[model samples]
Target: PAEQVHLSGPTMGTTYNIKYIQQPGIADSKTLQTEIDRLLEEVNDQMSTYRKDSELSRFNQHTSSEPFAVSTQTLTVVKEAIRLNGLTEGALDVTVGPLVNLWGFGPEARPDVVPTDEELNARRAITGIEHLTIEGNTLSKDIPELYVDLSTIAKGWGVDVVADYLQSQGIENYMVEIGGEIRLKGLNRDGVPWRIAIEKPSVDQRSVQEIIEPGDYAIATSGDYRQDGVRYSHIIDPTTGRPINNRVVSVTVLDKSCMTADGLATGLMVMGEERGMAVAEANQIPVLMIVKTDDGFKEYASSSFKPFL
Candidate 1:
């Protein structure tokens, strides 16, 4: 079978879509599906904050300032998140879980009403990267109250994991997308770079902003476009402990690693255009953003991202 093999499934509160050429001896569809499903289930079991019985939830409740024994993969994502926290100047904070909950974006989320300054400050006190540390597979907290949420990065991480699995099976031409964070390699069945559309952020409707033929890269987009967030933004600035009014509707990052792209996408959204572009410039990362302007909507792209056009 020389045609493409396709698979799709539910994962992490969203969907995962995969496509690949049926390279000889690559795992059959049934085995590949079962294996991928198992991997995703293990990911949720280890890192899903929504599940109270998850290991991440258990770690959140263990406020002993002691090293928490976690799976290596969970530790890996958390460590990268902490590093991104510094890289984005605290804009990409995993420890901002409490603040997210305070802002009504987490499990047991509050009503959309605004929080009092007194209440916000109380949550902010326990929310920061400084409160957490990782030593190998062991994670410890400077403050026992520190919380970690991998929602911003875990989907991309899972995509990377699935991609890694495909590569292990010697399948080179593949696309893996989990919840819009995507990683692609080699070519499509037509022997060309994988082409995909970047959707415009219209809460009421859907339209394509641009079509990108991404080559050997992972792409992740972050935005505050949820309908419920129409009245209030869902993306928050941990530095301010407030929802941002920056008018940036979406940021898509292209990187060799989807997890990095994932964190950068969210981090840049919180940083806004000026600061976000500056940060991207310094890091030499490719980024594309659509921002709301006084005139209407405008698009911007970092130097490295111009190839997409």
Candidate 2:
């Protein structure tokens, strides 16, 4: 016998929806609900920076010259983020808090007008992963007021964590999505590879750029098609600390882990197709990138992703 279950909750500043398909021997709805509650609590404890008592919030509040001790989860995510920053040659960064605030994206006062050239340059001066120091589980900032934002990768990490929890509970087939990024495992209730539609880079919801079958893999997409306001998009170039202006409209990456897939998608979007594809190939990371050309949209995918087709 097979059972289908759906669970949803708010985490990482967004709603997370998880669908699970299980065998007869698997746990019942009551047990599944308990597991979902546990996973939600764990995610809140680990990643909530909005709460004053949260680990990340405390780290952000401290202005001490000395390093502040961090939880194991925080340490792990930050280390991986730093490694990604170095790997992408600073394309993906967590040290863009100043820019994020200046652009009115963070929990700060909005700028009266768009930043002037000098103002943008001033913010860029403080943005770099190299300026951050992590010793053991402690994180310290060379600049006293430096802050870290994990918005880019936290949702995907939360999705992976929830998916892993489901697997531990003997659920095999499932699809998990946090915000727009998703991770699909096994098959649907009908026993077919999970199909996910990639949204076209347009304001209309009716358009889909492509459909992908992601079996036992994670897929994450990043785009600037929808803006909060006049701001270009949430995706910012860590190198210049500004919105990316290029031919690439959207980039999606498929990988074993949702965390890496999420970060790579953001990085590739900022790096653009030519340099992005080169980086993806060099690192053997699978990617599906769509670029808006004069003719229309050009799509590119890595060789490793060909197996899915």
Best-performing candidate as measured by lDDT = 1
Clashing pairs in 1: none
Q: Write down the lDDT that model 2 would get.
A: 0.78
The candidate 2 region of ten consecutive residues with least summed lDDT is: 224-233
Please provide, for model 2 over 1-309, each residue's C-alpha lDDT reduced to its tens digit, 9 standing for 90 to 100: 556678777766677778888676777867876777677666566666556677776777778769899877778778878888877778889888778777877767775688888988988887778778899879998876677877777767777877888888878899999888899989887778888987665433356545778789999988844332443666788766777777787788898888888888887888889988988888888887878777566778887766654
Which stretches in model 1 have alpha-carbon errors above 4 Å?
201-206, 224-231
Question: What is the C-alpha local distance difference test score of each model?
Answer: 0.86, 0.78
- TM-score of predicted structure 2: 0.90
- Residues 158-219, candidate 1, lDDT per residue (tens digit)? 99999999998898999999988999999998888899888776534566556789899999
TM-score of 1: 0.93
